[PDB]
Amino acid sequence: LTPLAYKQFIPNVAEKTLGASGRYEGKITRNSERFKELTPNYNPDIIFKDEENTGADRLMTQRCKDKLNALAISVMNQWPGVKLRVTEGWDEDGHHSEESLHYEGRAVDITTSDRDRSKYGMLARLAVEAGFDWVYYESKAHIHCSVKAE
């Protein structure tokens, strides 16, 4: 269980390559038809910042849900008392560089619920083993994980 290092990513290739999360498919919108592909995650074992208060955070694809929920489990087991925390989910706001998987509900930024920056390296390792298609120690303040489109 070798935690990831700052700026490290597993698998060791570019996020949108085929061996990872795959191709950008197109910004999903509130109104657009694809939007119905998103369902809200109401997992009580997961903490959603939701600074938008829109509930956008909870909105993700099914695969993204699946992996996030597995990760929720292994996080508690790993550090009892602590829970998984999502800081950023689906983006309506448009504050991600063009072609981010956030626009499609396929990517999340996470921390532990206590913001102990020391557990992040390990959090990323758990996200890899929860089955996230690309895991990346994007910042010292959060792990970025994303999933293939299905």
Residue ranges that bind Ca ion, judged by CB under 5 A: 49, 51, 57
Q: Using CB under 5 A, which of 15, 57, 104, 109 touches Zn ion?
A: 109
Backbone φ and ψ for 87, nearest 5 degrees, come out as: -95, -30
Question: Is the Cβ–Cβ distance between 89 and 104 less than 8 Å?
Answer: no
Question: Is the Cβ–Cβ distance between 66 and 85 less than 8 Å?
Answer: no
Cα–Cα distance for residue pair 150/136, rounded to 1 Å: 21
Number of residues that bind Zn ion (CB under 5 A): 2
Query: Please, which residue, 106 or 144, has the CB nearer to Zn ion?
Result: 144
- 142 has binding-site annotation: no
- 93 has binding-site annotation: yes
Q: Quick check: helix, strand or coil at residue 95? A: coil
How far apart are CB 56 and Ca ion at their closest, in Å?
Answer: 7
Report the interface residues with Zn ion, using CB under 5 A.
Answer: 109, 144
Could you tell me which residues are annotated as the binding site for Zn(2+)? Answer: 102, 109, 144
